[PDB]
Amino acid sequence: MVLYFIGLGLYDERDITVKGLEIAKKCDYVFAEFYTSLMAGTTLGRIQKLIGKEIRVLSREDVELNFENIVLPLAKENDVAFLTPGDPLVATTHAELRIRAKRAGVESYVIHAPSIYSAVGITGLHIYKFGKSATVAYPKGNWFPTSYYDVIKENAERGLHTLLFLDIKAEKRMYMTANEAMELLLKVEDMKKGGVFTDDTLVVVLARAGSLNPTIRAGYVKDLIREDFGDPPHILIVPGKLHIVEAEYLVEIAGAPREILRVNV
Amino acid sequence: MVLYFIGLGLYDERDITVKGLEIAKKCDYVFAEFYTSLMAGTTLGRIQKLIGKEIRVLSREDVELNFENIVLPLAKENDVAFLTPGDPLVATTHAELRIRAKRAGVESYVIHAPSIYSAVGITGLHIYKFGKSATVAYPKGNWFPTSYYDVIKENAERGLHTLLFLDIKAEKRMYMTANEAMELLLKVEDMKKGGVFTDDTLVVVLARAGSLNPTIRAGYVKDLIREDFGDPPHILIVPGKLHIVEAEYLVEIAGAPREILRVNV
Numbered sequence: 326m327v328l329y330f331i332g333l334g335l336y337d338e339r340d341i342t343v344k345g346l347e348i349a350k351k352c353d354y355v356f357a358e359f360y361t362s363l364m365a366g367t368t369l370g371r372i373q374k375l376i377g378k379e380i381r382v383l384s385r386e387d388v389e390l391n392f393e394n395i396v397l398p399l400a401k402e403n404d405v406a407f408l409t410p411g412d413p414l415v416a417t418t419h420a421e422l423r424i425r426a427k428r429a430g431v432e433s434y435v436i437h438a439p440s441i442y443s444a445v446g447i448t449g450l451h452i453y454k455f456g457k458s459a460t461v462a463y464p465k466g467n468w469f470p471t472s473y474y475d476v477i478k479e480n481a482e483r484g485l486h487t488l489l490f491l492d493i494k495a496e497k498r499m500y501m502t503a504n505e506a507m508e509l510l511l512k513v514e515d516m517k518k519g520g521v522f523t524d525d526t527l528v529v530v531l532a533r534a535g536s537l538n539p540t541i542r543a544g545y546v547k548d549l550i551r552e553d554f555g556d557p558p559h560i561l562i563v564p565g566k567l568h569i570v571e572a573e574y575l576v577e578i579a580g581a582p583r584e585i586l587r588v589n590v
Numbered sequence: 591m592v593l594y595f596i597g598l599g600l601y602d603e604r605d606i607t608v609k610g611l612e613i614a615k616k617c618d619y620v621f622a623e624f625y626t627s628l629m630a631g632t633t634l635g636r637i638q639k640l641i642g643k644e645i646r647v648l649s650r651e652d653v654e655l656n657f658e659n660i661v662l663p664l665a666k667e668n669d670v671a672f673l674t675p676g677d678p679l680v681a682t683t684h685a686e687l688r689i690r691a692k693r694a695g696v697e698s699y700v701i702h703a704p705s706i707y708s709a710v711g712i713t714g715l716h717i718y719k720f721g722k723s724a725t726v727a728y729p730k731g732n733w734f735p736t737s738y739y740d741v742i743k744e745n746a747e748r749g750l751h752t753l754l755f756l757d758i759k760a761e762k763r764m765y766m767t768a769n770e771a772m773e774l775l776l777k778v779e780d781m782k783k784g785g786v787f788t789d790d791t792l793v794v795v796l797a798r799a800g801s802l803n804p805t806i807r808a809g810y811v812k813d814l815i816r817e818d819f820g821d822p823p824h825i826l827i828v829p830g831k832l833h834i835v836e837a838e839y840l841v842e843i844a845g846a847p848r849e850i851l852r853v854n855v
């Protein structure tokens with residue numbers, strides 16, 4: 326009688342850890358949510374096939390409002406698993422679900438999986454140099470979010486890189502592209518005018534991390550803003566001051582302009 | 591003609607992803623390094639048994655100085671795998687190895703796995719609030735490194751959390767404990783008087799992330815500095831101001847004192 330939070334990883338059903346798979350295979354009931362992120366290289370059927378269990382998919386409302394009514398009751402007399410894309414506790418509010426488990430008298434365990442938060446290491450930028458992270462959210466009605474702009478400014482001022490998670494509307498199947506994120510940032514720049522994000526800003530785009538051939542591109546906004554980075558999901562990164570080795574990798578592997586090799590120490 | 595950088599994950603031999611395992615099994619040659627970090631919950635023998643392949647371990651010199659003489663040659667006419675603890679390319683020196691592969695006319699692909707960088711999400715602390723990361727190094731002789739202290743100060747000053755990787759003697763397989771790390775930080779504080787790390791500082795300890803039974807503890811230095819957190823590896827976190835949700839998770843899941851709900855939020 327336990328509840329497992331198991332990550333499925335970055336792109337396809339094989340991104341789950343062996344540990345996660347062996348445990349999931351022996352669970353009595355398996356639930357999952359696919360609104361926190363997009364696994365562009367698999368399907369529900371393929372995941373169900375690998376795990377050998379029927380997976381009941383829950384919506385954001387089912388989880389946030391009724392996790393304790395849909396999942397926990399069964400976990401009191403059975404072995405239950407809750408699957409999520411990437412790592413179950415990264416850039417989600419799932420951690421709070423463990424408190425609900427505790428209050429319901431259900432023990433919970435966490436099985437990690439590859440997360441975009443660490444996968445950005447494939448961009449060649451030193452992981453320790455990433456500062457505060459942010460999410461570029463779709464404007465709605467008369468509300469235009471801009472907090473992510475201040476995050477970039479604060480990090481850049483310290484010479485730190487900024488990871489920008491991009492918005493997603495799973496039910497409407499809308500996945501923000503790096504292009505849309507850039508357009509939104511240029512608009513915020515025109516408004517706040519802090520010289521934080523302009524056409525001359527160096528940015529890095531990582532699309533479909535986890536696949537064998539993700540798209541990794543670095544360059545100036547003026548050149549990348551209309552570039553096709555392939556299918557979603559996408560992540561946008563605004564580097565801070567670069568180490569020479571970071572620049573070399575962006576040039577050699579991400580096709581960045583050779584001029585960035587000349588860092589301004 | 592192909593080199594695969596495959597992550598082994600967090601703690602034991604089952605932390606590799608299904609993708610990594612299946613690729614590793616089909617490789618003609620398998621190399622590995624255990625100097626960036628160790629896999630405390632398993633052994634080289636258990637890893638070999640799972641992959642069903644003999645594994646040649648490479649030292650830091652083998653990699654940094656002779657990667658192109660030891661690994662790439664075989665990668666020219668065979669499928670070769672390079673196993674690393676955690677997620678590949680999180681360790682700062684690994685990215686460059688992909689440039690070496692390119693230079694040698696060898697294709698390289700990255701198969702991700704869980705990293706402690708993302709696994710800390712299990713502490714209940716929001717991942718976006720983590721700032722710059724640092725490593726607490728053992729002082730030696732006349733050398734007393736303290737840059738990690740400044741990292742904490744700069745992050746906390748901006749309300750950000752600080753992830754502290756603890757020193758390790760890979761060869762001797764000796765791990766710095768969170769207790770030793772706290773002792774060191776108090777020493778640095780007494781030297782800098784920045785008021786950054788004291789007996790009243792709230793800290794979080796995560797031990798054996800990846801294991802089904804990690805130790806997650808939160809509390810003030812004065813109370814945790816002599817506490818037993820179990821077997822290595824240990825990770826130390828100095829959180830910044832907490833969101834009430836983070837505090838409630840630390841209290842309910844990490845046994846933090848109720849006091850944090852009024853002092854650190």
Ligand SMILES: Nc1ncnc2c1ncn2[C@@H]1O[C@H](CSCC[C@H](N)C(=O)O)[C@@H](O)[C@H]1O
Nearest residue numbers: 362411412415416440441491533534559560
């Ligand atoms: N494979 C991938 N490639 C690029 N971006 C990705 C990605 N997976 C997730 N993201 C990014 O992160 C957002 C979801 S945030 C949830 C992240 C998840 N728990 C994890 O551990 O990765 C997406 O909208 C996208 O911007």
